[PDB]
Design a protein around this ligand. Structure first.
Ligand SMILES: CC(C)CCC[C@@H](C)[C@H]1CC[C@H]2[C@@H]3CC=C4C[C@@H](O)CC[C@]4(C)[C@H]3CC[C@]12C
Ligand SMILES: CC(C)CCC[C@@H](C)[C@H]1CC[C@H]2[C@@H]3CC=C4C[C@@H](O)CC[C@]4(C)[C@H]3CC[C@]12C
Ligand SMILES: CC(C)CCC[C@@H](C)[C@H]1CC[C@H]2[C@@H]3CC=C4C[C@@H](O)CC[C@]4(C)[C@H]3CC[C@]12C
Ligand SMILES: CC(C)CCC[C@@H](C)[C@H]1CC[C@H]2[C@@H]3CC=C4C[C@@H](O)CC[C@]4(C)[C@H]3CC[C@]12C
Ligand SMILES: CC(C)CCC[C@@H](C)[C@H]1CC[C@H]2[C@@H]3CC=C4C[C@@H](O)CC[C@]4(C)[C@H]3CC[C@]12C
Ligand SMILES: CC(C)CCC[C@@H](C)[C@H]1CC[C@H]2[C@@H]3CC=C4C[C@@H](O)CC[C@]4(C)[C@H]3CC[C@]12C
Ligand SMILES: CC(C)CCC[C@@H](C)[C@H]1CC[C@H]2[C@@H]3CC=C4C[C@@H](O)CC[C@]4(C)[C@H]3CC[C@]12C
Ligand SMILES: N[C@@H](CCC(=O)O)C(=O)O
Ligand SMILES: N[C@@H](CCC(=O)O)C(=O)O
Lengths: 756, 750
């Protein structure tokens, strides 16, 4: 048990990590330990701060272990019992550097009402004034640093990063805080390792191997204590790591962690608290030798370790700590400020409470913890002891919970000129102030987030593979819509995708549209068919002018003219828009006109009142058969005008959508009766008065059978594909209405014979 | 001073000896007796013997810290596997805070405070006595089982009351129990303020039960105030008024039937014999027994005036908590035995692996998962000692319902117990079956028949009005009157919104039996009569009116006659379309039939082949208007044909209702042509019987026009009997014209 036992009227304890625990820390333990001694003597040699009383110390060691800290911390509360190495009363102690050390000591000291303040315990678990009530700080908590790292990553467009932490209370506490900050800035962590302080071969190699097996993430964040950073860096050299490490205040600007393995830490970003170096402490440390520093038991080991010799065998014993081999620790001003916290607080508490004399009055024999800490420490405001500035940064003030203020810096490992040294790159007062001067690993800032890249709305298939938070883009949606991130839904078969891709709107179908391309072809025949009706009307106009008695066509010719007159008109409906009224009339018009014309010819071929009634009866029998099937077909007219030709939504088109095969089936028996009556004529061997007309009937009907037997296969092969294939169907129907006019021309030429 | 018992695994104690008699000495002797009995008892640590390290607490936090520092100064004395203490909440909290850092678990026996139930701050702390907030679950269970929902919660200013009330409020949400009002009872704020606060609790006559998480004095003074006000209440009180006759004192009040939750205890018989046998000579281990003997018996050992007095005279009674100390010490012993049987299996003695305390694994694994049998059992087979995952014990509560029927007053009678199950003996409660209810606190607007329901909750959560919508407004979700079918009452299905397709088609006679039979009879007679003239086809033609007029007349009468019969049909999508087509063609042809005949007479004052051409041309023009109107109108079935407050009665075509006005307009053109045709006739001499029929037809059109006005107003919104009757009149008038047209043929043939 080696410790400093400087006595005095009032004793201020301390806890420093001198041992890293055979080895001795050179920059974190000894440098901070000498700062407290330097501040203590200045307080004694002062006139405007607590005069007449000398301050002693009870500094101990922690070995960077929380369990060992508790055993040493028990010495502080020894003098607070008074029930039974004489103990000394301690007004307050200085907290340990590590967060884990501070937590264990703070919990123990809370019960005995012993105030404690730290200089480097930047942990977010503390500062909750419900458990660690008697604990103030000079440094900001561990949640501004998480924001600083998130801002740095977002500034360099870094998204895919990996994070590691230590099993100590400092490790996992800040990782959780970093999680929300990463999620807010649209970035994610690859993996969240939790490595312990056990060894290197068991765990450190596995952690590096996991990062090495996936070279996709080139930049990682090192949120670990300084104790665990030394061995990981050495382990990285063995595995030949080439990462760009982003370190917290743990690594900081230390030049002892990277010793012999600096070839892997190239271009590493480290965050360290801003602190102006103190010039007075430089003279004290540079003129420090073992021959005049018998107060420090650990100085002999530090001298034997920093300057390799024995007090290389025995050294010349003349060399001194000079600027050539000595650098100022960043967290030295905090230690000096920490010592002055009690020095100023006790001055505000001793003189004010006992204005009669500037000494230890009888009221100060027993110290208090509630009044000393809550009232005085939380409001103490005083300028920096040894600093050339008087701005807001120089003055130290405790917050509501007891803290400092965010002054995180952005260091960089920026080897230049053959010398390995850190160099300042930015500042994080409240805004990003990084300047682009860092010398990165190879030739520029390493790029990351190659697992996910900005895609285009054309694909919209942001599916997630087995890993997490990095989607890869693949084309999907063959004219579909994507209303979700990773799904390509199939839209309606009769619709077309929108420009915004969030929906599938109904494309405008194309009808015959009258004046158009070859689809307008049957319209020309329909117009020609209208002229045929006018010619038929002209024949009818000449028919009533003294009709021939021997013709016997008093009304059968008119019915035939009526049959062929609407045959041309039915072609107009078939080439018109697919209206519900037209779709119903298309089937009825074609069947009625064909049956009526065929029936009239059959009746004429086979007094005169009975054939007219028979012609109407047979035509009516077919007509009532049409409406018999119409009620099962036209009843879907409200549901008609629906899109069809749904072949992978390849430009679907709208049509009647009902009675497609039924209309073809309907025409089957319409012509079956016609052809049955055609063959029953048997050439109609009769008198020559009507034999020539019968020969015309025997020729027109014979041609009608041939064209009908050939038209039906044309209808089947042209099914679907409207406006390109239905045009042939419309052309055939118009041709079907045109040819029957040619059949009606046989009576016309017979009437022409009568004319002259 | 320090009490040390020779052993191997020394155990710690923190009883508040300072000299306190009924709380300090009793439990100390309890654990000493338990340790002595278990040292000689087999089946638990046969080789290794437990020790004792008893340090007083003085009921102070600083003294507790100073004494407990001894338990951590060793193995930072023999390494202590654990300490037993926690008589006071503050002492237990301080000791748990001190001992959590050194990984030395403890078991408590009397720390019932709810502040120690969180493992975030006290990770290595456990207790045997249940905390004070487990009574809340029993409260809600007994309240729900007794049909009580409206409660008047009463709290206390202390931490106990606040924790109990917050636990009860949190746990009552799952029990469907709402707090009518929440109040506070301070540490005796004022005598006159208690009347005000009890009035604030009793402001609602609906609520009759009141939770009473208050201490003994507060409950007693509140009961006194209630008795002064002379109010009637049932109080489901807490451990503060737990089977205590001092709290009720002599003020009976309304304490009858007040359910009380009281902690249970074991009547240990072995400990009584041991405790009655202590003397200040043989029991030299105790360093405070001399002071206790001096204080209790009022004598000094120096004066030699203490031997006469002895404990054999004064009766001995346990303070309802000696069981907990024995349970805690035996839980520690069983945990140590489980260590021995799982860490030193080869050797029955203490192996080298048990030299460390191993407190971290011990408490987490084999302390919270112990199920040892009940020790010193009075044969009540209760046991059930098992610390939960929150490091807290469980126990049973003996319900003590207040009663005064047997002893007159102050008779606490046990009813049941709460041990992982609610057990109430209703037959023992004074509110037996022959009573006007067990003072039902009940709820607010809760009992409803579900036929009427609003469920808006104007006030409290339990309060919800059940008022039905006036038309019942197709209520589906029992919360908002929906509009699935319409704004009136539907068939309601299986208690939900619906849309009944029910409607009247007027098929079974109804109020139109006459017109239905008249139309069919007239149609058959007219068709048969018309065929008589066609039989000859030679006699009428020589008297003019050839087959062209005969065919038109025959077609006209057939169309109008059949149009009357088609009216009686189901108004489907086809019927609405043909409804316009019915009179759009039948009335057109008959009007055009007489127009052609009238035009021929006017033109003669001929073109027989073209005589029918002009007649059908006018008919086709009327059909052209009909086809052009029906496509725009698009006739369809109309669901809305009933008034706002009536059910669906008629499903008449809504489109045809507007087309009905146009139907008269369509018939107006036919009527206008008929009037113009009649004027063109002028004189009608010789065979002109149709002129009289034309005049009758003009009256018929006027009658139809006269009957057309009520169709828009009332004749369409009615049961359609009048609408169907109008078709018969039009058909009959057309048949009357036919009777006045083929009147010559009726007489010439005869
Ligand atoms: C507008 C259209 C659709 C109405 C229905 C068709 C009409 C115009 C047709 C169908 C049957 C036809 C009749 C059939 C037979 C004869 C007998 C003849 O000696 C004179 C013409 C006459 C009387 C025809 C007139 C026109 C007629 C009535
Ligand atoms: C002249 C002979 C041969 C045929 C009789 C003419 C027929 C086919 C014509 C004459 C007037 C035409 C109508 C004129 C206007 C419209 C409105 C339009 O939105 C749908 C088609 C529709 C309803 C037409 C249907 C066909 C129609 C009724
Ligand atoms: C008298 C002889 C020449 C017969 C004349 C028939 C005329 C009037 C008929 C025959 C086919 C008819 C067309 C058939 C279909 C349509 C499409 C519809 O959306 C508007 C009306 C329109 C464009 C019709 C107008 C009238 C029409 C051209
Ligand atoms: C005239 C325009 C508006 C429509 C023409 C449609 C054609 C295809 C149809 C529709 C209704 C049909 C008429 C309906 C009823 C009859 C009565 C029957 O005893 C002879 C045929 C006849 C006269 C039909 C002839 C063909 C017809 C006129
Ligand atoms: C709108 C429709 C219903 C009007 C009527 C159309 C049909 C049924 C009509 C129009 C012309 C009529 C024909 C006209 C003339 C004659 C000659 C007569 O000696 C017998 C009846 C007969 C043969 C008729 C039969 C019915 C007939 C064919
Ligand atoms: C004017 C009269 C004398 C002769 C002509 C009658 C014609 C127009 C009638 C007779 C039967 C009728 C059909 C009967 C049933 C249906 C089914 C319905 O879902 C749509 C209308 C439809 C398809 C009707 C259309 C019109 C129709 C074809
Ligand atoms: C007899 C001739 C001259 C004229 C009448 C022709 C008939 C067959 C035509 C003309 C107008 C047509 C109607 C026009 C519109 C509709 C609405 C649709 O949702 C169902 C079919 C329906 C109801 C049609 C049925 C057939 C119809 C009634
Ligand atoms: N400040 C770091 C460690 C400081 C140091 O290593 O000096 C922590 O959170 O413990
Ligand atoms: N249960 C009380 C005291 C227990 C007792 O007095 O027995 C507490 O919170 O400490």
């Amino acid at each position: 048990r080696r410790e400093i036992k400087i006595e005095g009227d009032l004793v201020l304890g301390g806890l420093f990590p001198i041992n890293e625990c055979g080895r001795i820390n050179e920059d974190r333990g000894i440098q901070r330990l000498e700062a407290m001694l330097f501040a203590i003597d200045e307080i004694n040699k002062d006139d405007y701060l607590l005069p007449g009383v000398k301050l002693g110390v009870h500094i101990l060691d922690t070995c960077s272990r929380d369990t060992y800290a508790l055993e040493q911390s028990l010495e502080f509360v020894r003098a607070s019992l008074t029930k039974v190495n004489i103990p000394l009363l301690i007004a307050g102690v200085i907290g340990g550097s590590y967060s884990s050390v501070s937590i264990q000591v703070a919990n123990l000291l809370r019960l005995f009402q012993i105030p404690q303040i730290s200089y480097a315990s930047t942990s977010a678990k503390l500062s909750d004034k419900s458990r660690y009530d008697y604990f103030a700080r000079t440094v900001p908590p561990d949640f501004y640093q998480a924001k600083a790292m998130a801002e740095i990553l977002r500034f360099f467009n870094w998204t895919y990063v990996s994070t590691v932490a230590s099993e100590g209370d400092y490790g996992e506490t800040g990782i959780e805080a970093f999680e929300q900050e990463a999620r807010l800035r649209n970035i994610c962590i690859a993996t969240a390792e939790k490595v312990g302080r056990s060894n290197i071969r068991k765990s450190y190699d596995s952690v590096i191997r996991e990062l090495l097996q996936k070279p996709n993430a080139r930049v990682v964040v090192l949120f670990m204590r300084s104790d665990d950073s030394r061995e990981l860096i050495a382990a990285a050299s063995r595995a030949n790591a080439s990462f760009t490490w982003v370190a917290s205040d743990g690594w900081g600007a230390q030049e002892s962690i990277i010793k012999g393995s600096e070839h892997v830490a190239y271009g590493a970003i480290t965050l360290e608290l801003a602190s102006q170096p103190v010039r007075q402490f430089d003279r004290y440390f540079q003129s420090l030798n073992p021959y005049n520093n018998h107060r420090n038991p650990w100085f002999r080991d530090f001298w034997e370790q920093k300057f390799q010799c024995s007090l290389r065998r025995v050294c010349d014993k003349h060399l001194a700590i000079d600027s050539s081999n000595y650098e100022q620790e960043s967290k030295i001003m905090f230690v000096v400020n920490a010592v002055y916290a009690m020095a100023h607080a006790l001055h505000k508490m001793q003189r004010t409470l006992c204005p009669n004399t500037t000494k230890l009055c009888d009221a100060m024999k027993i110290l208090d913890g509630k009044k000393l800490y809550k009232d005085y420490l939380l409001k103490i405001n005083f300028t920096a002891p040894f600093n050339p500035n008087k701005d807001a940064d120089s003055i130290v003030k405790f917050d509501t919970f007891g803290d400092g203020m965010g002054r995180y810096n952005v260091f960089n490992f920026q080897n230049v000129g053959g010398k390995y040294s850190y160099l300042k790159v930015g500042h994080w007062a409240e805004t990003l102030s990084l300047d682009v001067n860092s010398i990165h690993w190879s030739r520029n800032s390493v790029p990351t987030s190659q697992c996910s890249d900005p895609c285009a709305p054309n694909e919209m298939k942001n599916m997630q593979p087995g890993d997490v938070c990095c989607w890869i883009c693949i084309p999907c949606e063959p004219y579909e819509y994507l209303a979700d991130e990773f799904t390509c839904m199939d839209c309606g078969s009769g619709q077309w995708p929108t420009a915004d891709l969030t929906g599938c709107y109904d494309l405008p179908e194309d009808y015959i549209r009258w004046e158009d391309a070859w689809a307008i072809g049957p319209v020309t025949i329909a117009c020609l068919g209208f002229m045929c009706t006018c010619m038929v009307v002209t024949v009818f106009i000449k028919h009533n002018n003294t009709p021939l008695v021997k013709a016997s066509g008093r009304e059968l010719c008119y019915i035939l003219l009526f049959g062929v007159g609407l045959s041309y008109c039915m072609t107009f409906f078939f080439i018109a828009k697919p209206s519900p009224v037209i779709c119903a009339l298309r089937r009825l018009g074609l069947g009625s006109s064909f049956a009526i014309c065929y029936s009239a010819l059959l009746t004429k071929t086979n007094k005169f009142i009975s054939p007219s009634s028979q012609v109407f009866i047979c035509l009516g029998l077919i007509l009532v058969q049409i409406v018999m099937v119409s009620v099962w077909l036209i009843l879907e007219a409200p549901g008609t005008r629906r899109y069809t030709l749904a072949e992978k939504r390849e430009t679907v088109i709208l049509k009647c959508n009902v009675k497609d095969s039924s209309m073809l089936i309907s025409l089957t028996y319409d012509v079956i009766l016609v052809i049955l009556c055609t063959v029953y004529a048997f050439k109609t061997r009769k008198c020559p008065e009507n034999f020539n007309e019968a020969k015309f009937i025997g020729f027109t009907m014979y041609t009608t059978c041939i064209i009908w037997l050939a038209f039906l296969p044309i209808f089947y092969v042209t099914s679907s594909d409207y406006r390109v294939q239905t045009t042939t169907m419309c052309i055939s129907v118009s041709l079907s209405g045109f040819v029957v006019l040619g059949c009606l021309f046989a009576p016309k030429v017979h009437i022409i014979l009568f004319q002259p | 001073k320090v009490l040390t018992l020779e052993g191997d695994l020394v155990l710690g104690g923190l009883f508040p000896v300072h000299v306190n008699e009924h709380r300090g000495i009793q439990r100390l002797e309890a654990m000493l007796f338990a340790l002595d009995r278990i040292n000689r008892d087999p089946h638990l640590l046969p080789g290794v013997r437990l020790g004792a390290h008893i340090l007083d607490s003085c009921s102070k936090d600083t003294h507790a810290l100073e004494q407990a520092l001894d338990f951590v100064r060793a193995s930072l004395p023999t390494a202590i596997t654990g300490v037993i203490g926690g008589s006071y909440s503050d002492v237990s909290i301080q000791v748990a805070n001190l001992l959590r850092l050194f990984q030395i678990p403890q078991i408590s026996y009397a720390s019932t405070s709810a502040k120690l139930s969180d493992k975030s701050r006290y990770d290595y702390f456990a207790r045997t006595v249940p905390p004070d907030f487990f009574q809340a679950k029993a409260m809600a269970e007994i309240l729900r089982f007794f049909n009580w929902t409206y409660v008047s919660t009463v709290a206390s200013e202390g931490d106990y009351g606040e924790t109990g009330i917050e636990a009860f409020e949190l746990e009552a949400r799952a029990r469907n129990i709402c707090v009518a009002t929440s109040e506070k009872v301070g540490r005796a704020m004022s005598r006159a303020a208690f009347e005000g606060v009890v009035r604030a609790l009793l402001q609602k006559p609906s609520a009759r039960v009141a939770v009473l998480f208050t201490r003994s004095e507060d409950a007693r003074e509140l009961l006194a105030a209630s008795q002064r006000l002379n109010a009637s209440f049932t109080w489901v009180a807490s451990d503060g008024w737990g089977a205590l006759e001092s709290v009720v004192a002599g003020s009976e009040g309304a304490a009858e039937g007040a359910i009380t939750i009281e902690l249970a205890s074991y009547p240990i018989s072995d400990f009584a014999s041991y405790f009655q046998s202590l003397d200040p000579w043989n029991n030299s281990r105790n360093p405070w027994f001399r002071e206790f003997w001096e204080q209790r018996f009022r004598c000094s050992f120096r004066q030699r005036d203490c031997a006469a007095h002895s404990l054999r005279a004064v009766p001995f009674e346990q303070e309802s908590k000696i069981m907990f100390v024995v349970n805690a010490v035996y839980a520690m012993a069983h945990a140590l035995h489980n260590m021995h049987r799982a860490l030193c299996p080869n050797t029955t003695r203490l192996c080298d692996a048990m030299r460390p305390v191993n407190g971290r694994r011990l408490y987490k694994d084999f302390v919270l998962n112990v199920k040892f049998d009940a020790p010193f059992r009075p044969a009540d087979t209760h046991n059930e000692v098992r610390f939960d995952r929150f490091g807290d014990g469980i126990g049973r509560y003996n319900i003590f319902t207040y009663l005064r029927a047997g002893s007159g007053r102050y008779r606490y009678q046990k009813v049941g117990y709460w041990a992982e199950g609610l057990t109430l003996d209703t037959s023992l409660i004074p509110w037996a079956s022959p009573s006007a209810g067990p003072l039902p606190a009940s709820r607010c607007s809760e009992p409803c028949l579900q036929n009427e329901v609003k469920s808006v909750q104007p006030g409290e959560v339990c309060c919800w009005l059940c008022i039905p919508c006036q038309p019942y407004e197709y209520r589906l979700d029992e919360f908002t009157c929906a509009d699935c079918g319409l704004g009136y009452w539907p068939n309601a299905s299986l208690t939900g919104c619906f849309e009944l397709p029910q409607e009247y088609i007027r098929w079974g006679d109804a109020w139109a039996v006459g017109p239905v039979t008249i139309a069919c009879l007239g149609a058959l007679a007219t068709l048969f009569v018309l065929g008589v003239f066609v039989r000859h086809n030679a006699t009428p033609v020589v008297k003019a009116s050839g087959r062209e007029l005969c065919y038109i007349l025959l077609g006209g009468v057939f169309l109008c006659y059949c149009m009357t019969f088609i009216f009686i049909a189901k108004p489907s999508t086809a019927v609405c379309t043909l409804r316009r087509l019915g009179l759009g063609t039948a009335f057109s042809v008959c009007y055009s039939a007489l127009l052609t005949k009238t035009n021929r007479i006017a033109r003669i004052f001929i073109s027989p082949a073209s005589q029918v051409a002009i007649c059908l041309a006018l008919i086709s023009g009327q059909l052209l208007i009909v086809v052009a109107w029906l496509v725009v109108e698009a006739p369809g079935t109309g669901k809305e044909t009933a008034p706002e407050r009536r059910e669906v009665v008629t499903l008449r075509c809504n489109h045809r209702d507007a087309s009905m006005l146009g139907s008269l307009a369509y018939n107006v053109l036919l009527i206008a042509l008929c009037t113009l045709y009649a004027f063109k006739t002028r004189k009608c001499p010789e065979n002109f019987n149709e002129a009289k029929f034309i005049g009758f037809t003009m009256y018929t059109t006027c009658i139809i026009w006269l009957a057309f006005l009520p169709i828009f107003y009332v004749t369409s919104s009615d049961y359609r009997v009048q609408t169907t009757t109008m078709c018969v009149s039009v058909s009959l008038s057309g048949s009357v014209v036919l009777g006045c047209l083929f009147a010559p043929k009726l007489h010439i043939i005869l």
